[PDB]
Design a protein around this ligand. Structure first.
Ligand SMILES: *[C@@H]1O[C@H](CO)[C@@H](O[C@@H]2O[C@H](CO)[C@@H](O[C@@H]3O[C@H](CO)[C@@H](O)[C@H](O)[C@@H]3O)[C@H](O)[C@H]2NC(C)=O)[C@H](O)[C@H]1NC(C)=O
Ligand SMILES: *[C@@H]1O[C@H](CO)[C@@H](O[C@@H]2O[C@H](CO)[C@@H](O[C@@H]3O[C@H](CO)[C@@H](O)[C@H](O)[C@@H]3O)[C@H](O)[C@H]2NC(C)=O)[C@H](O)[C@H]1NC(C)=O
Ligand SMILES: *[C@@H]1O[C@H](CO)[C@@H](O[C@@H]2O[C@H](CO)[C@@H](O[C@@H]3O[C@H](CO)[C@@H](O)[C@H](O)[C@@H]3O)[C@H](O)[C@H]2NC(C)=O)[C@H](O)[C@H]1NC(C)=O
Ligand SMILES: *[C@@H]1O[C@H](CO)[C@@H](O[C@@H]2O[C@H](CO)[C@@H](O)[C@H](O)[C@H]2NC(C)=O)[C@H](O)[C@H]1NC(C)=O
Ligand SMILES: *[C@@H]1O[C@H](CO)[C@@H](O)[C@H](O)[C@H]1NC(C)=O
Ligand SMILES: *[C@@H]1O[C@H](CO)[C@@H](O)[C@H](O)[C@H]1NC(C)=O
Ligand SMILES: *[C@@H]1O[C@H](CO)[C@@H](O)[C@H](O)[C@H]1NC(C)=O
Ligand SMILES: *[C@@H]1O[C@H](CO)[C@@H](O)[C@H](O)[C@H]1NC(C)=O
Ligand SMILES: *[C@@H]1O[C@H](CO)[C@@H](O)[C@H](O)[C@H]1NC(C)=O
Ligand SMILES: *[C@@H]1O[C@H](CO)[C@@H](O)[C@H](O)[C@H]1NC(C)=O
Ligand SMILES: *[C@@H]1O[C@H](CO)[C@@H](O)[C@H](O)[C@H]1NC(C)=O
Ligand SMILES: *[C@@H]1O[C@H](CO)[C@@H](O)[C@H](O)[C@H]1NC(C)=O
Ligand SMILES: *[C@@H]1O[C@H](CO)[C@@H](O)[C@H](O)[C@H]1NC(C)=O
Ligand SMILES: *[C@@H]1O[C@H](CO)[C@@H](O)[C@H](O)[C@H]1NC(C)=O
Ligand SMILES: *[C@@H]1O[C@H](CO)[C@@H](O)[C@H](O)[C@H]1NC(C)=O
Ligand SMILES: *[C@@H]1O[C@H](CO)[C@@H](O)[C@H](O)[C@H]1NC(C)=O
Ligand SMILES: *[C@@H]1O[C@H](CO)[C@@H](O)[C@H](O)[C@H]1NC(C)=O
Ligand SMILES: *[C@@H]1O[C@H](CO)[C@@H](O)[C@H](O)[C@H]1NC(C)=O
Ligand SMILES: *[C@@H]1O[C@H](CO)[C@@H](O)[C@H](O)[C@H]1NC(C)=O
Ligand SMILES: *[C@@H]1O[C@H](CO)[C@@H](O)[C@H](O)[C@H]1NC(C)=O
Ligand SMILES: *[C@@H]1O[C@H](CO)[C@@H](O)[C@H](O)[C@H]1NC(C)=O
Lengths: 434, 119, 121, 432, 119, 433
């Protein structure tokens, strides 16, 4: 009867939105990239009496994190030496040395003729290679990727060590965070707070096992888009970490070869001391308890009258059939088949042998290749297993999987949503102009 | 900052300056695009408030009557039992109507002011 | 519609100020970004100037600077009707800066006068 | 007389201006990865009732803008492609005599050469076919003694699609709707639009293909028709249909150059080897020229003779008609379309064509593109919507020239203006 | 432009239009950054004046009293005998405190206007 | 009693660092400095302003340095990389019309190189200066900077001649200028003006002596960060110019060599007529009076009874040990020891050497090849100052520098960038409503 339109500005409302996020932090590629410092104060604002709907599989923050890592990774390799001049026939024989375990035949001693600083001359050089880097054509060999792409040597001073990255909203935007300790992955969430920046997320790249992520507050949280449709990956988050001790035991050196006028190649040099197999150690008791925790929670979706079995998985690609792990400066491909072979019906340790690969084709791309410079000395890493990526095949059987990469970030970004602030609006009041 | 969200409409209006301030304050082409957009969004809202005769105010009263068509709820049951998110959804299909009416009103008002000053 | 009043007389077009104003601020890609920045700068220069003259917030601003017959020696009946804005713009183009300067001086004096009136309480 | 200054904002006035326009499109094409902004169906046009705007197509900056953007786009799309530097070796060539239906006599050649392969320590012997226009028994390619030849990526289409140019904020585009607008001077039926009608970026020579038609009669336009050194653009009232083909069933041979580097060579030809040609309706063409003649006489006098004849600047850019048919480069002989004397007092026309693969485009000579071969048989059917004519009784000949003249045939009706919303007028009021 | 910079504040206060009118009018990434920042700084000041209720004015009086804490200098020695640069040096730490008070005052004033207009 | 009043348009500022832009009026600084400036001088005088200026730790200097390096590098991007020519050379010591002073200076070098087709070769020859040719470690020679880096050929149509450059503030910023004459690079300055753009500064590249630029208004001005610290350079600005004229008296020819796909290398061709060494002439009387003025104002920091002596350079590469007079497309390395031998007919000549492969800005991963100029070069320029270092009862001064920032501090010392902060608060007898 006597109500009039009053216009208000600064109204605390929003809409779901897709915008551009920027990073912040605290010769690393991400330290160079994330030039914006974070505020030591999280500035987290609790929102009382709200029920926000979240969906981790529809979250565009995932696409940006993926896009940003690909872009950064590639940009950092642009101003580097190409190894196109190394795509020549190699003459390779097996390394004869004090070689133990089953490493005999794993390494080869390759000699070849490459370019020099002088256009009129070639030089005879040699280097060591792992079997996984070299393809036989006969003692005649080629590097594996010379038939599809140029191989770029990564710049030796560039560090790809993951450091925490914080994603921050631009002005006019905000990030809502779900604090429900039991959050499903989809649906309404109570105890939602607003933040400016996310917690730091380390851009760790791996398959099968997820290393150095966040832990669940209680039990195991099992999240998948459908569960029923076994084609989807299951992301399993643990409330306890499992420590894994990894090493490359050989004492390596480098042989620096000049290949042109301001360009050089780092060859794997002679091995100092005996040759041993690379491997990872997982405490057995901890691992068996961890699976028991996962299986108990997994049963909630299948029944408490069933059987849960694990498989060693399968595939046509080392990136997914083995545990892809980046330790220090070298890429490991570890055998987890003895880690996932139990069947669950209701001091000791397991050693996982690991293979080392030097020519890397990341992000499942074909047209690009990177040569990982060899690392001097002996390599040791200790990592935290914080979660697993599993797939499913009357007994149910589960196996290690992943490799899409996006799934390695969904596990950290599932609690965040980006919204757009819409500060202008109207409502009826008793107040009239003039 | 959305700290008052979830509180009722009559409570939330107490913080309009908090939300307003934080709207503007907060390869590289990526950041310029983000910054330019933030400026453009800010200015679009300021232009609307200005064109409706609400320049410089967070709360402005107009001479456009409330249509029971848009909402037939009483003053009570809007300001005390609802938050802004709920309100925004209930009348989300009339926003463009109200905005058009507000612009027409301001044009008429300015014309009348000019003719009054003429005396 | 936008510029629909362009051929109408000056006193007719006064009813479409809203329409023109609301469309000014936006209703290799580097050039798109450059265009967006300039559109904002043009918009702001006009808004700053209205602020300087004390016309902020109004589409129609009445000032206290008298009109000089020198700029144009015509009656209201010879300006508000029987003439479009395009024609007028050409007619007084050479006095634009004089007028703008006078408007600035007036507003500055008005602000000082207001501060003194508030002080005298 | 108590008259005071009043300031208005939102005043519907403007100034002539130049600016940056952006592209928009409807709905692997080179322009589809550019014109990422959708257009508005029913874009809305606003008629201005009493505006007599002056337009000038020959001083229109939009032509320059369209031209520079096309050149830029063209070059940018060829950057991430395989260079053919490794093919700048000598060739050993013989003629193809394998069921040639006469009149080639070496136009198509069988060549072989020593080129690179997967490893740097190896070489390979390869075979390919070439067209005579691309080749200098010892032969070289025509563009190996200067610049470099880059192979166009087989994955990018250069098919023209409609391009709409749209004004940035603060600007508007005025469109001239007057009947028989000749390119310059005042226009009465002026309307404001946000974007252009959609122009296909066709790159033909001599004849203008797939453009807009005139609605009442043929329109003759030139900057100064009496100068005898300007191109005359002719906009036709009706289209003339032309059927163009390359009848030979070809093949594509994939040759490895290096590490992910591939060359697409012309392979063997299946079936008889025949000449490319275009079929122009004769009756339509005879009527079409008659209409042009009637209109040209309005500028030259009722007692003159137009006299059609062919051009002489034989660089194949001026004397022949380029199409980009199927992405192929035809270079057709149009002299058979222009040899007649008009005095005031199915029987189709067949034009032979000359296929060429190494193209120095946009009259530049510092760059060259190699057009990958197209397997199968090519046919295009298109609409002749205009002509480029020149003159020197006085004789008319097909012209040719810079691309700005083709694009100016569609942008001739549009002008860009800057909106100037702030203004001042006297009024009977005071601030107080 | 800045001709009054070395002058007495009581004189310098009359050249405010001169400084304000020169704030907007006077390698692609660097030029865009320069332009965007110039705009951003301009808008930050305009938003802030709006929040405090001083939009559209170069000179405004408010309802926040002056504290002896900020300065115990008398009035004559503030407007005379001293430049703006010198005044700026004196009032440095007591800046954000004023801004907070200005915001609080304006919020109370807008609420009061809305309630008064409902009678 | 007093109320808060807020003012906008307040004439105050803060020290600040921002990005400045280039303003002007086929040069390398053309097309990259497209804003015409200074149609009318500004110079707004600020009465009663005593601002603090500092030549050292300035921001304008760092940007000028940074921008020049960037521009310089950008200009070489589209030109020939001289991928070939690291082949070894078969060189002959040329004696034809050469005097004893230049024996072994020029070499006639022949070599194999590629051509238009990949499997074809050609034999060419050209002349080189001794400075750019090193005997191979294995009559066989190589170019110096070929074994460690690519040499980009300088673009034949790009002029690197310095043109005046004006630096201009972005909106919201202003440049303050110190008009004092006794300023000496630091401290409070009385008589400060405000400008939008600096005076034009010519980006002349040099070492040891400062060439075309401004003169001191009254006397010789000696500026140093710490006059007592022998690790710092002394910039001496003269109040009088000294003319120097340099020449390369050899009628050169150019030999164009085609590389690959129509790329061209411009080789030094033969020499028409007599072959003679490059040299520079400096007026003797002017130079001796100039030093007298420099020492008179230098003794002020050491004592009226101390002895000042001059000496030549201490060591390092030509970039620091010799004068690096840069002619329109040629790099001269001149011997200045003859200018610095005193203790405190009518001309002195300085011998000069010519180098073509240039490593600029003290960098070693880049090199540029300067193509030859036909005919004879004659350069006339003004000496405006010196870069000196110091190292009892007697002090020794030597030529020094090489840090390009020193050649820019000498023009930018009087400018400071400040940020305008138009908003402020003061008390008043005025209350709202
Ligand atoms: C999970 O987090 C742990 C702990 O941050 C990661 O292991 C750590 O990796 C860094 C970098 O490789 C090692 O630092 C090294 O220090 C020596 C000197 O002590 C230096 O010479 C090397 O160049 C390097 O900077 C650090 O020692 C190592 N920590 C442990 C306990 O081994 C681990 O890699 C992360 N997991 C994954 C999958 O990335
Ligand atoms: C004037 O416009 C006509 C169309 O109205 C243009 O001809 C058309 O060109 C396209 C592309 O070359 C042809 O489509 C192709 O068809 C094959 C087989 O179906 C397919 O494999 C290709 O991927 C592609 O879709 C289209 O059929 C053809 N239309 C006609 C009637 O032949 C003509 O080229 C334009 N004029 C000029 C000068 O460009
Ligand atoms: C210091 O300033 C003087 C005076 O501006 C500079 O002298 C000028 O130097 C240029 C480049 O070497 C000479 O340009 C050439 O002139 C000939 C004339 O025939 C022309 O054919 C060439 O194409 C080129 O343009 C210019 O003539 C000369 N000016 C005079 C009066 O001699 C001097 O180079 C500057 N010194 C330094 C170190 O920058
Ligand atoms: C264009 O000009 C015509 C006259 O040439 C305008 O027609 C007048 O319209 C008003 C509308 O209120 C009538 O009262 C007048 O009687 C009409 N005059 C005549 C001679 O018919 C027309 O309105 C103008 N267009 C625009 C947009 O204003
Ligand atoms: C993890 O969850 C289990 C659930 O039974 C609980 O017993 C255990 O104490 C929890 N561990 C930690 C570290 O909180
Ligand atoms: C890793 O090595 C440390 C060495 O002190 C040991 O304490 C820890 O238990 C080991 N972890 C595993 C999983 O074996
Ligand atoms: C949430 O609801 C309770 C009543 O159930 C009320 O007391 C409290 O103030 C509400 N919180 C907010 C933010 O309004
Ligand atoms: C709103 O109006 C209806 C009309 O039927 C009435 O029944 C209801 O009690 C009113 N509610 C309030 C809060 O006044
Ligand atoms: C402005 O001055 C020029 C001088 O040539 C004159 O032609 C023009 O008509 C003048 N305009 C006005 C509005 O008086
Ligand atoms: C191809 O035919 C032409 C016909 O004029 C002849 O001149 C040429 O020599 C022939 N080519 C070869 C390799 O025989
Ligand atoms: C030409 O065609 C005939 C059939 O008409 C066929 O027998 C003959 O082999 C063909 N010749 C060539 C060179 O293909
Ligand atoms: C390869 O080079 C040799 C050099 O004698 C030549 O005889 C042979 O014909 C070449 N191969 C090809 C395909 O031209
Ligand atoms: C403008 O449109 C009207 C529509 O009735 C038409 O009669 C008139 O001839 C047109 N004017 C021109 C110049 O084409
Ligand atoms: C048009 O052509 C005539 C031919 O005599 C010439 O005199 C005139 O100058 C030309 N005008 C223009 C504008 O080119
Ligand atoms: C035109 O050319 C044809 C052959 O293509 C010829 O028969 C005809 O006579 C020619 N006509 C004229 C006017 O030259
Ligand atoms: C500078 O100080 C003198 C002192 O007498 C004063 O008269 C003059 O007005 C001051 N200058 C300015 C710009 O205020
Ligand atoms: C402001 O004035 C009050 C007056 O009671 C005083 O108590 C207070 O200390 C003053 N200063 C500040 C910073 O509040
Ligand atoms: C060059 O040849 C002359 C011949 O008389 C000789 O005296 C001189 O020492 C030679 N110089 C060099 C560097 O070989
Ligand atoms: C070119 O190479 C041949 C290879 O036998 C060699 O004999 C000749 O001396 C070289 N020529 C030059 C100028 O280096
Ligand atoms: C430079 O000027 C400052 C000004 O205070 C003075 O103290 C210093 O001694 C001067 N230095 C030289 C070398 O003249
Ligand atoms: C060249 O330098 C000498 C030095 O003695 C001087 O006398 C002569 O005038 C100078 N020439 C020019 C053109 O300045």
């Amino acid at each position: 009867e006597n109500l009039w339109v009053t216009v208000y500005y600064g109204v605390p409302v929003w809409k779901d939105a897709e915008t551009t996020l920027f990073c912040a932090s605290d010769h690393n590629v991400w330290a160079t990239h994330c030039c914006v410092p974070t505020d030591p104060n999280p500035q987290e604002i609790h929102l009382e009496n709200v029920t926000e709907e979240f969906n981790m599989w529809k979250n565009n923050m995932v696409e940006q994190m993926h896009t940003d890592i690909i872009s950064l990774w590639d940009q950092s390799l642009k101003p580097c030496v190409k190894l196109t001049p190394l795509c020549v026939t190699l003459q390779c024989t097996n390394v004869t040395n004090n070689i133990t375990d089953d490493m005999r035949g794993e390494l080869k001693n390759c000699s070849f003729n490459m370019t020099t600083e002088l256009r009129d001359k070639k030089q005879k050089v040699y280097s060591l290679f792992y079997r996984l880097d070299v393809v036989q054509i006969n003692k005649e060999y080629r590097l594996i990727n010379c038939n599809t792409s140029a191989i770029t040597q990564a710049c030796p001073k560039v560090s790809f060590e993951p450091i925490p990255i914080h994603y921050c909203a631009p002005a006019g935007f905000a990030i809502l965070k779900c604090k429900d300790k039991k959050f499903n992955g989809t649906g309404p969430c109570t105890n939602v707070s607003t933040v400016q920046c996310t917690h730091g997320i380390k851009p760790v790249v791996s398959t099968q096992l997820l290393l150095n992520g966040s832990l669940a507050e209680e039990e195991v949280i099992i999240r998948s888009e459908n569960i029923t449709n076994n084609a989807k990956n299951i992301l399993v988050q643990l409330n306890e970490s499992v420590q894994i001790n990894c090493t490359r035991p050989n004492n390596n050196t480098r042989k620096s070869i000049r290949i042109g006028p301001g360009q050089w190649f780092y060859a794997t040099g002679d091995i100092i001391g005996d040759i041993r197999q690379a491997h990872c150690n997982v405490s057995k008791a901890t691992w068996n308890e961890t699976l028991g925790k996962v299986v108990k929670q997994l049963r909630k979706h299948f029944g408490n009258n069933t059987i849960i079995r694990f498989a060693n998985s399968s595939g046509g690609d080392l990136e997914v059939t083995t545990h892809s792990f980046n330790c220090g400066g070298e890429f490991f491909y570890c055998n987890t088949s003895g880690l996932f072979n139990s069947t669950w019906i209701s001091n000791d340790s397991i050693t996982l042998p690991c293979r080392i690969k030097q020519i890397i084709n990341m992000w499942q791309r074909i047209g690009q290749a990177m040569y990982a410079p060899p690392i001097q000395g002996v390599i040791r890493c200790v990592s935290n297993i914080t979660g697993l990526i599993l797939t499913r095949d009357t007994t149910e059987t589960f196996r290690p999987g992943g490799g899409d990469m996006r799934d390695n970030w969904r596990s950290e970004l599932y609690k965040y949503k980006v919204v757009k602030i819409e500060p202008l609006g109207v409502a009826p009041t008793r107040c009239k102009r003039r | 900052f959305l700290g008052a969200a979830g509180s009722t409409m009559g409570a939330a209006s107490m913080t309009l300056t908090v939300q307003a301030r934080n709207l503007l304050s907060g390869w590289g082409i990526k950041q310029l695009q983000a910054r330019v957009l933030a400026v453009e969004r800010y200015l679009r809202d300021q232009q609307l408030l200005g064109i409706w005769g609400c320049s410089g105010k967070l709360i402005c009263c107009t001479n456009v009557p409330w249509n029971s068509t848009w909402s037939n709820r009483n003053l009570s049951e809007i300001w005390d039992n609802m938050t802004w998110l709920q309100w925004d959804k209930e009348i989300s299909n009339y926003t463009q109507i109200i905005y058009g009416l507000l612009e027409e009103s301001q044009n008429q008002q300015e014309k009348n002011e000019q003719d009054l000053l003429a005396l």
